[PDB]
Design an enzyme around this catalytic site. Sequence first.
Site, PDB file in Angstrom:
ATOM      1  N   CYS A 197    -121.578  27.115 -26.892  1.00 49.71           N
ATOM      2  CA  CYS A 197    -122.823  26.783 -26.014  1.00 49.71           C
ATOM      3  C   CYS A 197    -123.920  27.888 -26.085  1.00 49.71           C
ATOM      4  CB  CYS A 197    -122.201  26.270 -24.710  1.00 49.71           C
ATOM      5  SG  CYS A 197    -121.034  24.899 -24.819  1.00 49.71           S
TER       6      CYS A 197
ATOM      7  N   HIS B 281    -125.426  24.224 -17.625  1.00 51.75           N
ATOM      8  CA  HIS B 281    -124.014  24.205 -17.097  1.00 51.75           C
ATOM      9  C   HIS B 281    -123.241  25.556 -17.120  1.00 51.75           C
ATOM     10  CE1 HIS B 281    -123.110  23.586 -21.587  1.00 51.75           C
ATOM     11  NE2 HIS B 281    -122.324  24.767 -21.133  1.00 51.75           N
TER      12      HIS B 281
ATOM     13  N   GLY C 215    -117.017  28.034 -26.345  1.00 53.70           N
ATOM     14  CA  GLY C 215    -117.572  29.181 -26.035  1.00 53.70           C
ATOM     15  C   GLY C 215    -118.838  29.354 -27.110  1.00 53.70           C
TER      16      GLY C 215
HETATM   17  C1  LIG Z   1    -117.605  27.131 -19.138  1.00 54.22           C
HETATM   18  N1  LIG Z   1    -117.876  27.095 -20.646  1.00 54.22           N
HETATM   19  C2  LIG Z   1    -118.017  26.086 -21.229  1.00 54.22           C
HETATM   20  C3  LIG Z   1    -118.313  25.819 -22.492  1.00 54.22           C
HETATM   21  C4  LIG Z   1    -118.465  24.343 -23.045  1.00 54.22           C
HETATM   22  C5  LIG Z   1    -118.986  23.238 -22.403  1.00 54.22           C
HETATM   23  C6  LIG Z   1    -118.681  22.156 -23.125  1.00 54.22           C
HETATM   24  C7  LIG Z   1    -119.238  20.992 -22.276  1.00 54.22           C
HETATM   25  C8  LIG Z   1    -120.723  20.988 -21.360  1.00 54.22           C
HETATM   26  C9  LIG Z   1    -120.788  19.791 -20.740  1.00 54.22           C
HETATM   27 CL1  LIG Z   1    -122.113  19.823 -19.639  1.00 54.22          CL
HETATM   28  C10 LIG Z   1    -119.883  18.617 -20.778  1.00 54.22           C
HETATM   29  F1  LIG Z   1    -120.048  17.636 -19.950  1.00 54.22           F
HETATM   30  C11 LIG Z   1    -118.651  18.736 -21.661  1.00 54.22           C
HETATM   31  O1  LIG Z   1    -117.797  17.552 -21.436  1.00 54.22           O
HETATM   32  C12 LIG Z   1    -117.545  17.020 -22.873  1.00 54.22           C
HETATM   33  C13 LIG Z   1    -117.971  15.423 -22.959  1.00 54.22           C
HETATM   34  C14 LIG Z   1    -119.228  15.186 -23.147  1.00 54.22           C
HETATM   35  C15 LIG Z   1    -119.438  13.780 -23.156  1.00 54.22           C
HETATM   36  C16 LIG Z   1    -118.676  12.734 -23.037  1.00 54.22           C
HETATM   37  C17 LIG Z   1    -117.303  13.055 -22.598  1.00 54.22           C
HETATM   38  C18 LIG Z   1    -117.155  14.145 -22.661  1.00 54.22           C
HETATM   39 CL2  LIG Z   1    -115.402  14.822 -22.364  1.00 54.22          CL
HETATM   40  C19 LIG Z   1    -118.451  19.780 -22.367  1.00 54.22           C
HETATM   41  C20 LIG Z   1    -118.615  21.811 -24.303  1.00 54.22           C
HETATM   42  O2  LIG Z   1    -118.691  20.872 -24.967  1.00 54.22           O
HETATM   43  N2  LIG Z   1    -118.039  22.978 -25.191  1.00 54.22           N
HETATM   44  C21 LIG Z   1    -117.852  23.065 -26.583  1.00 54.22           C
HETATM   45  C22 LIG Z   1    -116.713  23.019 -27.004  1.00 54.22           C
HETATM   46  C23 LIG Z   1    -116.350  22.836 -28.378  1.00 54.22           C
HETATM   47  C24 LIG Z   1    -117.586  22.845 -29.247  1.00 54.22           C
HETATM   48  N3  LIG Z   1    -118.760  22.453 -28.700  1.00 54.22           N
HETATM   49  C25 LIG Z   1    -118.992  22.763 -27.415  1.00 54.22           C
HETATM   50  C26 LIG Z   1    -118.011  24.356 -24.453  1.00 54.22           C
HETATM   51  C27 LIG Z   1    -118.515  26.926 -23.270  1.00 54.22           C
HETATM   52  O3  LIG Z   1    -118.813  27.062 -24.477  1.00 54.22           O
HETATM   53  N4  LIG Z   1    -118.308  28.098 -22.872  1.00 54.22           N
HETATM   54  C28 LIG Z   1    -118.320  28.168 -21.207  1.00 54.22           C
HETATM   55  O4  LIG Z   1    -117.846  29.295 -20.829  1.00 54.22           O
END
Ligand SMILES: Cn1cc(-c2cc(-c3cc(Cl)c(F)c(OCc4ccccc4Cl)c3)c(=O)n(-c3cccnc3)c2)c(=O)[nH]c1=O
Lengths: 305, 305
Positions: free
Chosen positions: A145, A41, A143
């Site tokens: 991930c 992602h 952040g």
């Molecule tokens: C662009 N980007 C994105 C992320 C990032 C992405 C995510 C994230 C990734 C995917 Cl594929 C999702 F489908 C997603 O949907 C949440 C969800 C899952 C299942 C059912 C309903 C729902 Cl609503 C969330 C995330 O959960 N987190 C996170 C946050 C807090 C703690 N742990 C993880 C972080 C990142 O860290 N850095 C960065 O640059």
Amino acid sequence: SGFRKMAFPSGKVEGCMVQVTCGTTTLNGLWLDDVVYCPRHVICTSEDMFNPNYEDLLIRKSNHNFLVQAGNVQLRVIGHSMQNCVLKLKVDTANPKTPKYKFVRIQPGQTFSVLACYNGSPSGVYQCAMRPNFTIKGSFLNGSCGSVGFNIDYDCVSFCYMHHMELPTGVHAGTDLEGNFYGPFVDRQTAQAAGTDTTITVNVLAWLYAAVINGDRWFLNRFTTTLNDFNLVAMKYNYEPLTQDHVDILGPLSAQTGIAVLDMCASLKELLQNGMNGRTILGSALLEDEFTPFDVVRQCSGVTF
Amino acid sequence: SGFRKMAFPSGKVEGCMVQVTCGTTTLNGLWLDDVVYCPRHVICTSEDMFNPNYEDLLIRKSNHNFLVQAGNVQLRVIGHSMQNCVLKLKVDTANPKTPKYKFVRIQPGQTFSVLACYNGSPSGVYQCAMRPNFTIKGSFLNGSCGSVGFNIDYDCVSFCYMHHMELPTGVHAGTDLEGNFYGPFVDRQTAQAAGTDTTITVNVLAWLYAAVINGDRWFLNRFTTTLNDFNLVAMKYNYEPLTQDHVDILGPLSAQTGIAVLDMCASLKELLQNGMNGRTILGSALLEDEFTPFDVVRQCSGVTF
Ligand SMILES: Cn1cc(-c2cc(-c3cc(Cl)c(F)c(OCc4ccccc4Cl)c3)c(=O)n(-c3cccnc3)c2)c(=O)[nH]c1=O
Ligand SMILES: Cn1cc(-c2cc(-c3cc(Cl)c(F)c(OCc4ccccc4Cl)c3)c(=O)n(-c3cccnc3)c2)c(=O)[nH]c1=O
């Protein structure tokens, strides 16, 4: 003596952490030999996260759209592929800090260490268990991930977990390092729930052995039980059923303490039926299930890596 | 989200751990620049551990009686001195993995990470607090002496603890890195007890803020109290008295949650007087006091090192 929630020394993994940027997204990556692994992602925008077409998204990207930084060392990307939910970026330089390592898929109930990272920078290390329902109860912020879980045996790091997301319930889901999710989850923002979880009976018993070894022994009684009888109680209280294989794994601890496994099961049955009465076990007011039998012997033996 | 007992990444310290041998004793040492630091009881035998004359013992030793091994690299010892309860061995090679570092004496109630080591080999990492009575509740086996505690801020390791001994009660005592013991202890096998300990009130309050930030909010009530009134309750339940300086340190968390510190004190007073009622806070059935306010903000912000 004493008993702590102990993680593996994280040094061998800190040296593999990099920052991967694709467009606006920056997140964490794992640099081993000449390959960097990260959640796919990384190639997504805010929209199209509700039903991303990862093939079509990855097709708009070139080697030069993936910026990999290790410290301030900039890596040159010479290839890119997607395997399940993981992106694999081929770089022209082998990581000189690559430890001996392998990729392993762990079983529910097993434990591992997590090195939480932000912008490719390690922030903290903690221990935790793959829940029976294939979630982990982590501590992760946006952040994080691409952070990974791992176990270490002498000099060999066994990577078992890469962090992908937080569910609406605040629990965490991720993949093994071939990109296959643990449990039923998909990397889309859709409504997905974890299954019913349960307590890891064999881990609770290993921890009661750890408590006796350290002198916390008030919970021992003069009763015993049968596997069948105990499993009646385990089901009432949402505990994993106990099997002969679990008993065997507890063999070492049984032999060291001289307490038969079915005797310790009678102790646990008493605790499930009557609670703790406001007392504590190894500093806890509830039954801990995130130490495996291996964890107890390692920490009650003095093993090094 | 989520909240874990999190340790600092231990990589910067793993690279400083060595094995120090003097006669029959082998234990752990800390190699920084061209100096190795270890407990001075490395020069003791079984007897004369009940009233060791460390000066007279150190006088029978020469540079060549101290064997320092880093992996299989053998260091050449060119000097040796004793500072308080620490031995300082001058070696002819500067450790090429020396991080930025300083030696600091921490205050009771502050937290730090411990890298447990055996035969100079790192084994596990865990977090813990200097108790008000200057003990630590560690997890240490025979052979762990010379393991160190530390905090890390960006790239600077602040070494604050070196492990010296386990008391007959199973708790642990050690020195700062200038060899001065924390608390009343001496490095002899004599009858010495820790003073009355207490719970770290300001840490318990920071943890209740951490719980609200993560959604564990059942304990909030509509009462408030005064510092004076709350300190009445703290004394009945063996809690450290709360000061204006503690309130100020909780200022950030108060501002982030919008819960006044005296309001959260009224919550804590209710919990001390009525217990938890079989409920849990951040996965615990008792009040946790080993997260400082700094620890809570670091883990509820996403700070890296
Ligand atoms: C662009 N980007 C994105 C992320 C990032 C992405 C995510 C994230 C990734 C995917 Cl594929 C999702 F489908 C997603 O949907 C949440 C969800 C899952 C299942 C059912 C309903 C729902 Cl609503 C969330 C995330 O959960 N987190 C996170 C946050 C807090 C703690 N742990 C993880 C972080 C990142 O860290 N850095 C960065 O640059
Ligand atoms: C030769 N040698 C010795 C040690 C070693 C020494 C000690 C140790 C060191 C000193 Cl100065 C003592 F006065 C001592 O008296 C215990 C005691 C203290 C206070 C009041 C009464 C009593 Cl009885 C013990 C130790 O406590 N431990 C340990 C064990 C378990 C967990 N943590 C620490 C280990 C080692 O690790 N390696 C190695 O080679």
